[model samples]
Target: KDKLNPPTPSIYLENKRDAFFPPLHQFCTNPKNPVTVIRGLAGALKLDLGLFSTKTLVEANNEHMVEVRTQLLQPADENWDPTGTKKIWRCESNRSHTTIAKYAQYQASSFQESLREENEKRKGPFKTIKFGTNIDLSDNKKWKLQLHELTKLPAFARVVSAGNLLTHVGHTILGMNTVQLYMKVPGSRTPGHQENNNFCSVNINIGPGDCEWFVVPEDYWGVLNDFCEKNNLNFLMSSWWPNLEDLYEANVPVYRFIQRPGDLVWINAGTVHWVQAVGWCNNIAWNVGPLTACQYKLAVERYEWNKLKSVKSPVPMVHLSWNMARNIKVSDPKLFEMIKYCLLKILKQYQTLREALVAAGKEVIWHGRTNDEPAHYCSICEVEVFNLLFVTNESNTQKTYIVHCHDCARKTSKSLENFVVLEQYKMEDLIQVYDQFTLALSLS
Candidate 1:
């Protein structure tokens, strides 16, 4: 695999050099990862206007923002009796989607303007929360829009300071690593969700006004799970807005807060939370990994659970773990040891599965895959498949993706040869990468 160097991100921190990992001698110095919190920079977590402003961002991206895609919302009553919220995007819609320019020009509106607009619709009450989320700032395509310097703030400095694995991998962490932005009108609510793939997240609302939040503590992971299960709900999706009254009855403790402009909110890895906008506002955030044993354990647990339930693992832990093994040299003994174990466990599974396929007369063909490619998960079961692919088409060059694993491929055809077995990496190649990573760590 190629050692593709990650970009040098723009970082506003106490020191510029602090933006990368520590020297080898200093690797293990800080092992305890901090959980979630709201950060105050003396006054409020509000970003310094002189440092940067939402106005500047709007001016910079407004042209590109016109055709922006957004979540479509159906008119719903306050109780959502008829239907829940909706996902999926439309290009431009008078009924649902709105451009950032239009969103920003609702006159940087406060609660009054937003309320008046929603009231006019009476297309029913409490129209579904609509917003444009996942406006990424890490693309490097927009040279002026880097928000990495915000990590210099007290709450974010630790994770942004090279010691963070997500920083090392940077955009390779895919969805979570991007400096995500949110632009919404008043009353727009993000449904309850833990951080995608369970990495702790950092959020700061750079608002002209405030927003309300409901955050559940990490300890109640199962309490919420059973509550979801009892209703026959899909537990992982941010599909439902849990009624605060129901949660209270369930004895679930929730921390409620008003996030004013400039406050930094750090939601712990695996903590569940949701929010509703107060006024037209802009917010930016991204997940920051702590690399502690707890973070790793919880992430792996969720990864396995997603696999078992046929839910697509957004973080693709198997693909990510291998990449981590190839790139990182961890100092904390527990974290390092955990990574080693994860690597070994996956390797053993690969070996066992390959041997099983071989005994069943399956053959392997070398498939060209690259480090930069996104992970391949089973199209059916959504299990992350790495190093090998059981592609449905027999044509060596066929690219219409209907990926399968051996077991699942059998559902298509009992004869294994019906599918092309594309092997991306041999066992020795993966083991060699693992061995070299461990050997480098052992040097310290």
Candidate 2:
């Protein structure tokens, strides 16, 4: 559990825990296959949110939300009793009505068969009922498979319907820089036909010391809605409610993957998903979740907050494809490794320095003020400031953002919030100020 200097949450999920796996070369180096750019820039890339989307996505999207979203409060919402926090977005689990797939490969093939058999068996058995002959597995088929990594000792739900999976088939094992996060949630359907409370659930949780904001893709709210409307699908939004919850409504914590060099996350199904990159990334996702019937992405029609927004055609391959199999060595391995090591060391050092400064009674400032509740921010949209003195005409833009005191805030008068004037105060202007300072000192 790493902490940031400003005493905030760990936004990016780092694989410090759990056993580490070696580079899966199979996933990336296949000729017949390609990977997402997020997966390719493992160590060399660090992009803000904007790098992920095309220009078209920015104009078309809104925040992704769940219909039955809920949250928990710190001081209990008028209730005298609080156990682990109020269950936000609560729903009565009548018989759970949930299925857990044990082995991903097995479940994919078998769930499809079981679904067919169940409907066939019910045809003759329940013929006496009103809608007897029309025994449809459609509702049962749409029951999203809440995938979890359960420990051994039980054998149940061995076979899952392939329809329930979203596999990153083209490039998987052999892939190296292609990052993926295999997340699960607690209290999810598990193996052995019984709920395993101790199952290694991968729910999204945000720790202190993370970035301030996340981008809400436009298709999030409309994905299911459009799918249900276009195809005769009876889709609902509750399946995505966990992700749409506020800090009070959503108990499943949000995780921001602060990506560094040489990191990878392997994601399976039903794990609420998103990714951010400052550089190009190559991703291969195998989505084996309950929403496979809605195969076409919301990005396909809606063209909103998605990395694939640039893709204009129904076939995504034409626009956003990446040929991972090519021998494209962008940097020297040894040099890259050395630079990465030094950067990590420097980052770690700065992190420690910030902590020491705070401990030694130094003040730390955050982007958000005490009076303001946290508001959503687009990850890639950068904010910069400029400080130009009337007499000198010399500006200090970058470092000026590092405010030293309350007086500094008054002096600037919040002009930085506006981007136009800020751009005029360039980094080069700051250098002139340093030169002027040197000349003044010499003259004195």
Candidate 3:
């Protein structure tokens, strides 16, 4: 029983070594490790993963599997609609019509040879590459419904319980439950596509083969980052070939592991990692979140930084921070204290942003709204807003409220009856909220 519950910050565990493993809460309290692995947790035998690896995925669709050659081809073949409103099945032609396993094996070999040859030449910009057909599990009612139905099975109960357990520990915000099917042919590798959020993942390998992972430790990121800048490279998106070797030379530890059937790996936030498929490999990946306050702040900073260089914007971290505060109660003083500090940091940051926007004469939009409050956005910019200016036109027996930002409010050349800021919340007000929650708790 003791073995079943490893102490907090445990880096790794295996079922044969420890019959039962601690739930998600134990790890989230303070995870010191970059990765956590559980061998045989998904059950060595008799585990129904809902989607049959050999049955529906490969055997029943043998010809279809052969067609899924390049990752790019699959989406193109499906005529994927970019709006993401409609579901499209991506199946690429690998230029063969063989058993799914055999076709995958051949493709993997070709993939390995190409990578090895490219590495030897060392003449081109390292480009990131991804292999395998992604099953649109979210849109599939059968698979989606089955996952919900399997909530109670021991194999699945662990995952289901962990989702709640995570929130209880302050990882209150979750990303979309994106379930991806990674079918790796022999010699296939998932190149550098860093996870874009402050979230973790629970990956279960359902394999006819295993995979090896190479993860860069967080401590070493600064060193590699400096190297990338000197070379005019984008670390997050660009494929830098000398990454693994450079880390080794810098004496930074790179964690590696082989994932087998029924193995589970929990990847921590901001850890840059990639994988190579040994033969025919299949796995399911789910994004999970509640980033530590510091991580959330860093994520926001990274997003702002990305905005200047890339067109991509990050998920609203500050908006989600509020969700974390609301979900945590005052019963557990330790957790409450943690929440207090989190909110304090967030309030301070928001205050800074508010001041900057105010000084610049720019309009800051806020989308944090309650269900009862009808949603409002900046009338000029059309950006969603909160605590903005509400210009009211009160005519005889008629009244209307219009929302606009400070800059927009002043710039409007048209005459207004009564222009007043509405729902303004200052940092002190936010502090009072924290105090209220804290006072609700018995500090003793």
Candidate 4:
């Protein structure tokens, strides 16, 4: 009994509690590979699926849910030609079924105002924009009222009850980012999409068509990377339609799953996947839970390697760290150790950068609200940073510098000798930020 089960990488479970553990705990225990399936979880939610369909969605809430048109890859579609005569359009799908991927699809930020402002500025060829039915529902009161009606259903209560059990066990934290209802019109395919965050997504199928997901395991991520590299493809932007020869040479096994109405699919962190809509499909989904400590460290390392591009999380990564540190009593020992190591490492690097900045006569602000604020930002990665590299802008007439993280600095054309640390923060002020983790660890 002392020996733990070698953690089920992925699993299917009923939405019920056992004598030993609840469903969510069982889901989190094997954090190694965090994919899960729950039959009839959508039925339990009891949301009126018809209200989210194209015509019905507009009928129910016109202001919130709007129709958008997108181009599809025809059967004869081909990649870029050498002459560059082909018209290329970057797909605007947010790597999510619903909300924008670049913007963190969370409560406050996942709104129409937030979306319209961002979409209007996009210079890509994919431009026929409108309100997406999937994500904008949360912005309307009528939808919430309907959702409230669903919550009163006995079936819906079971989900809430199950969720509470997991929370009581300290297996998960409260707070969800967004509630999205997706509709994939007929003859459409969601391109290969992945995120920088280790998101444990709860996806529920509630409607008209089935969705077939092609999932690549985390261990096999390298295979996908290698395949893309050999073909000179951008994995994020590619359609991922490889020939039989390419598939055979790569020797990658893709796990395929068909999610029908009322089925729930849990997509674990770092899993590269894409889906095809069989006919028309409708589903509701949201992102919940924090990254496991190991994953958190990996997220940081990926940013450093430029493997991860931008941080589009609704919650700032550092904000999540602060909250996680505040609540670490029941976390896994290994997870806490990794978390501790990462926090300390970032602080140490910040200190070194601070010294260098001060030596260069850069102004370092010592007093301010340090918690949950982005004092330093990496211009290259576009992520909020604790440690940063900046260069004086020779072209700019104003007093400004181009900022880049340590990792991005290597790739930047800016002279390394001219690189200076960020000038707005001090090492001592960051001590409070660093000590939060230590205090949390001591208590734990």
Candidate 5:
């Protein structure tokens, strides 16, 4: 897919004929397009999107006969601790990539069970289970087809499909795609966390149920991060569900809200949030990445931050930047400038790095030229290995090539004996890509 050229002319003529589909760049949010409610607010909001969103599978009587793997849920340890240390060490809930069949047969029956738990005299957090498999929107294509299948059963219900970044382009960008069919009862807790790799998230409550949401807005993300570190926890990675007292003590204002059924909760990129299902409800959740400087900036920022600590950030920002340059037509001036700045810096950095390697009389090889192959990252550092990778084969069995960044390669090996430098792309080509994108935009 070339954005400049449609795969078929008939579709174009049909777009002309019915005047049904106008174009992509024309999307925006206002009162008219309620699903536009799905558009970014940079924070979670209380909005009823019942008109735009489709009914959850929890609503329909299904004629299609299929079975999905079902999962189990665990109870919170007694007293509802925020420390996350006393969380139940359960076998099934966390590990199970676990399902449902039939519209009415499985999920309906399952929710019925989760609801019954509310009255049980003794309580633990073990309230619900994974009643259905995630129907992953695959962060990329069939963007409509998949949504169609889901809503064919009354699921996505046109939740601003057109305004979503996932609909506009396809990327594995975390599989930030998928309807996480969260079927849970009250008291079910999802620990404090941020959305996917710093992108915005939208959660729809398919009710007859409600959910409790506690959020720490994006401004305090850094403060919360430092708080987690100072307290010897990884709130971003692991659990450190903050106590209301600690948060107030830290002076971080936390917002509390209840998500009733038939409502949608929109969270901006990088907002820290936690959730507890208040009733037997099925939630339809997915993430969004708006094509804007703010979204991209935050996403890239966290990707680099995670790399510094040797933790994995799902969105590979460098590769993703180049990916956008080639694929997206710059329509927004601010994002256009952001993309250009990153590409320019990336180009210069590569050239300087390559020149140094050449001066050292090092041998260079070309790899990862094909678009189908994924980007390489340092095996140890977990950062992407770009042009000028320092690569070495495993010593014990000579089985695999170990990729390292320029610095890490040297730190891990001496004399440069075991290492070879690899290039993913050339400066000449990358410069042209940057130049071409600029010309396409005519930023003048």
Candidate 6:
């Protein structure tokens, strides 16, 4: 039987050979290539990468799949021993591990092409991104960025990967979950002859998963329903909302509902939110819009299809018309303040919820740490998840954590060919990506 010891970092690097390949010597011993030991070479472990990134996987056999994409605050040129680093990383032979590896490989090739093309399309004058540590928002630290205008996806698509603190914190509702996004869909017009670039903007609600707070408790259900009707949310393919609050808060204090990162959130039409590219978020997103529209004729046809359905015979269909209106916090101060108040109130509840989750004496992954191993496994592994969590806080900043997630590890194995190595890579990358993405977004 194979030992349960996790592989060294280099073994995880080997999987990148083809988006989760078995460990190979070339990655470890190629002295001429300093980057061979880079995590990207191992391909990204099958984890829920932060919602912002497009590069889902790296190819192992593909000549370019040698280095994993990492957000090093500074250039990671610290080591020259390509082989020694390689020696530090090892692999395992687990059936579930290989299955996950193959799956990741297949996914990487398919997803990478789409990601590359999407980024390429964003080229030109509209493109905007600032590279390097022009600003920093690491855990235990803070950075502030002042902006006179709304930032665009191109800014996120390129330029800065994390470190835009002011933008993230400013975008946050209460320094908890929910980052505002502003996307002007090209060629689309807003109501009243207003020019709207046609981008659908909404917040990635990342706080506590308590739908009841917004619904029955806060009495915002009507508003949400109206918002949904106006936005045509029902037409979407699918969505999710946690019942955690619905379960526990049936008779609790109203303000005790919040959401954390990694909690699956839904983005419906007409949801006015902005993308926070500041702190860090550990998630990945797949945008249907990127794939469905673009070709000259296809663009026109799609536009026409949406346009044809856009006009309502009754005009304002919802009892509430914020119809075709977004970012209206500028126009409707009362409405904006109302939404903001609800968001913050809900967020404030997390401290209590977290306390309860911890005191239950059960090890549990922070909902934000979605891809990590669940609580029970960590307990089995003799890891103190509860203690680890108590030490983590939203504003604590620049976090260096030692989290134990057998659940994450198990899932990581299911995502790669080398179970042990993939789990280790995933554990490391999850922290790296979360701080780089979700937390980055939280920085205002």
RMSD values for the candidates in order, in angstroms, are: 9.1, 24.1, 11.0, 10.9, 10.5, 27.2
Q: Which stretches of candidate 2 lie over 4 Å from their true place?
A: 1-24, 28-265, 268-444
Tell me each candidate's TM-score: 0.75, 0.18, 0.60, 0.64, 0.68, 0.17
- In order, the Cα lDDT scores of the candidates are 0.62, 0.23, 0.52, 0.49, 0.56, 0.24
| Cα lDDT of model 2 by residue, 1-444, tens digit | 121111212223223221222223222222221111122222222222232122211222212111121211112112111243442222212221111222122223433665698799740111110000101111222312212221110111111322211121232211111112121211121111100100001121111111111222122324424433453432231221122334224222333344333332322211223332222221112222212112222212222222233211211221111111111121334323432333344335445544654575544333322221121111222111112211111323343332222223335544322221111223343334322321111221
Report the Cα lDDT for residue 314, model 1. Answer: 68
User: Whose TM-score is greatest here?
Assistant: 1
TM-score of 6: 0.17
Q: TM-score for model 4?
A: 0.64
Whole-model lDDT, model 2: 0.23
How good is model 5 by TM-score?
0.68
| Residue pairs that clash (backbone atoms under 3 angstroms), model 1 | 12-149, 20-162, 45-262, 45-263, 46-262, 46-263
* C-alpha positional error of residue 21 in candidate 5 after TM-score superposition, expressed in Å: 15
Candidates by lDDT, descending order: 1, 5, 3, 4, 6, 2
Which residue window of length 10 is worst by lDDT in model 4? 165-174
Give lDDT tens digits, candidate 1, residues 1-444.
111211211222233233233441122222221233333431432345333355676666764342232333433212343333432111112224455566566535544665798789852233333466666576566624355456455434343555465665423554476666777666666766777667777777777767777777666778878777776666775356666566666777666667777665666667777777776677777777665777787788878777777677767777767777777777668777888898888888889888987898888777766656777878777787777788866545567656787679888788865787888887788989888766234444
Q: lDDT: which candidate is best?
A: 1
Local distance difference test, candidate 4: 0.49
Model 3 regions lying over 4 Å from their true place: 1-20, 23-30, 44-46, 50-54, 58-130, 149-176, 290-314, 330-432, 439-444
Instruction: Residues 1-444, candidate 3: write the lDDT tens digits.
Output: 333222322234443234334454345324466666766765633356545474555434454432243433212112232343443222112322344566456546766786799899852112222355544345345455435533433332233353332333322222234455666655454544446654566677878678777666554567767766776766666544334445555676666677887777767666667666675667777655543443454455565555465434334444444555655444554545655666677667667656865685544334234443433555665443445445543421253566775556657633323454444555565667666664244564
